[PDB]
Design a protein around this ligand. Structure first.
Ligand code: CA
Lengths: 294, 294
């Protein structure tokens, strides 16, 4: 657990959380316009289709009702395109804009450093960790000293046993073997009293450490929460604006196309042609013609 | 007037219609192809736009139930794409292939060779007028003659008469101008007879031309009715496929999206971060250690 929140210098992860917040806003904005582009393309593709074929049918050999039928399928194209433009718009007028604004209130860059709120936190954390930071260094100092002190007690306590294995003219060196082994014995007992002293000491200051880091933290959560809430609301706003269905207009388009079509009557059609281009049209039959004369 | 269909070879007016319907078959094809090609374009941008973001937010700082939620939009895109494909397919697989399948069943080309149906219409009209075609050749000249005699006739009279007040002279020249006049009054009657004969016989083969023309006509209006019936149905197929509002699937995509998002829980998420990255994380508090060789 060297990667735990309580380990000195780890609150940083949640400090990052903040710089991230602004960045994700950024992201949602880029997502939105991208959507728009797509929505603009479709409906712009649409009217370009409506026009081409509107003109084609009107210049064309088609006639009568069938012409108007096949006609209406261009207004569809148009109406739908107008919707997808409605859609583009909102993504860009409301939804996008909302984010751009919210992001302008929550975060503010500062000339020296990053965001203001990022600092306020970053300092809050240091502040609450300072005390525990100091102590925690004492601690690893004393351990470091005490271990060393126990390594030396084993440096001479066994060495004496190796030096008295020589048993060769060392009455002055036999006194040093029992001199250092009892000197280091002092160190060990001492360091274990100092180190142990810090240990119980740190234990008296952990709650305070805890209340502390836990206070700057809940304050962080507060701010996070403020964007998480907003963000959800944005995403609803978007779904709303993306949704064509449950939009009267949309359904309306395809009822209107439908009846235009069924409206087509080949009979009336056929009759028109008869009267307009066929035997139905008047004919001057040969008649006895006198001289003009001029 | 010379506009009417009975006159000369104005049968052509509907002999065109017969072939007009061919290219109309073509046009519909492409009008559908184009748009059906347009549907595919939208869908591809979408699929790409989800694939591309799903990624981004996957590997971005956003987490918990708000990421998943914002993700939920990518999957409305994906789903919306899939529907636009059905629109395309249905356009190419069914509709565009109905007019193709239809066109081969009712438009056999008669070995270069015009369109078997046109050339057969044309013959139907050539043959029903050929007979009456020469009865109007006989009549145009048979009146040209009567008119000619009627001119040289009053020309000779008024020369017998413009002469009657010139004396001298002479009795011989006065009998000559009297011959011409008598002779000219004969031509008038002879040519007026002929004309009148070619006339009442033309008035005899009238209902027989009238009704021998309208035979080919119903042959020609039955085969235009053959498609204006078809066309009406395809414009009902194309409308079907094109509509999503009346697609249970579409409207579900957005009931689906609204469920997805509402589900998001800031709280739950906050708590989650708190346990996976905050004070909730398990800590290894300082404890008394011992001495130990590697
Ligand atoms: Ca993630």
């Amino acid at each position: 657990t060297t990667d735990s929140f309580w380990e000195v210098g780890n609150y940083k992860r949640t400090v990052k959380r903040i710089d991230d917040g602004h960045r994700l806003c950024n992201d949602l904005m880029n997502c939105v316009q991208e959507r728009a582009k797509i929505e603009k393309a479709y409906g712009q593709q649409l009217t370009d289709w409506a026009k081409r074929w509107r003109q084609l049918i009107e210049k064309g050999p088609q006639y009568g009702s069938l012409e108007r039928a096949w006609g209406a399928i261009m207004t569809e194209a148009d109406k739908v395109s107008e919707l997808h433009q409605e859609v583009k718009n909102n993504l860009l007028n409301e939804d996008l804009e909302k984010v751009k604004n919210w992001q302008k209130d929550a975060y503010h860059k500062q000339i020296m450093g990053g965001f203001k709120e990022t600092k306020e936190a970053e300092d809050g954390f240091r502040k609450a960790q300072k005390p525990w930071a100091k102590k925690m260094k004492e601690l690893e100092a004393a351990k470091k000293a005490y271990h060393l002190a126990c390594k030396e007690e084993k440096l001479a306590m066994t060495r004496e046993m190796n030096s008295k294995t020589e048993q060769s003219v060392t009455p002055e060196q036999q006194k040093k073997l029992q001199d250092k082994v009892d000197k280091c014995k002092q160190d060990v007992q001492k360091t274990q009293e100092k180190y142990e002293k810090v240990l119980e000491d740190v234990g008296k200051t952990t709650p305070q450490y805890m209340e502390n880091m836990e206070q700057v933290f809940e304050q962080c959560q507060q701010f996070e929460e403020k964007r998480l809430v907003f963000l959800k609301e944005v995403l609803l706003d978007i779904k709303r604006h993306l949704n064509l269905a449950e939009n009267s207009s949309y359904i309306h388009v395809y009822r209107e196309l439908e009846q235009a079509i069924r409206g087509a009557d080949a009979q009336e059609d056929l009759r028109w042609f008869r009267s307009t281009s066929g035997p139905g049209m008047p004919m001057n039959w040969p008649q006895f013609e006198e001289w003009n004369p001029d």
